[PDB]
Amino acid sequence: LYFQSMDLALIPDVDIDSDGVFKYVLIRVHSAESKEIVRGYKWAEYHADIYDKVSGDMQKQGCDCECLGGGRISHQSQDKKIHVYGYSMAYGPAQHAISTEKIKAKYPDYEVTWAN
């Protein structure tokens, strides 16, 4: 038979928390046909905690993941500013320019900035 792969269109490009500073990762999801997604959550003690949660979820849907890097996101809803910066020891620094491309697409009325 043939196996129907997850439509990546239905995987949110961005899922981040609000009003505060938190770890994030940039993940490549394979159908597996691939795209980069931003995931960042206040509950995560480590970047690896985010990647483990996300890649587990993806694996449930038959997708495979690669972590491309991480850092931090500062989300200020009051000021409609999102800043993406920093690094991950486990995964290296993400190319925050990619992350911000995603973020800006979802929060187009925000000032979306990066460093590096």
Catalytic positions are 47
Cis peptide before 32 (omega within 30 of 0): yes
Query: Is 90 a known ligand-binding residue?
Result: yes
Query: Is 88 a known ligand-binding residue?
Result: yes
Instruction: Please enumerate in sequence order all residues whose Cβ is within 8 A of that of 33, keeping only pairs 6 or more positions apart, or say none.
Output: 5, 8
- Please tell me the distance from the alpha carbon of residue 99 to that of residue 110, in angstroms, as a whole number: 14
Return binding residues for substrate. 23, 88-90
Return binding residues. 23, 88-90
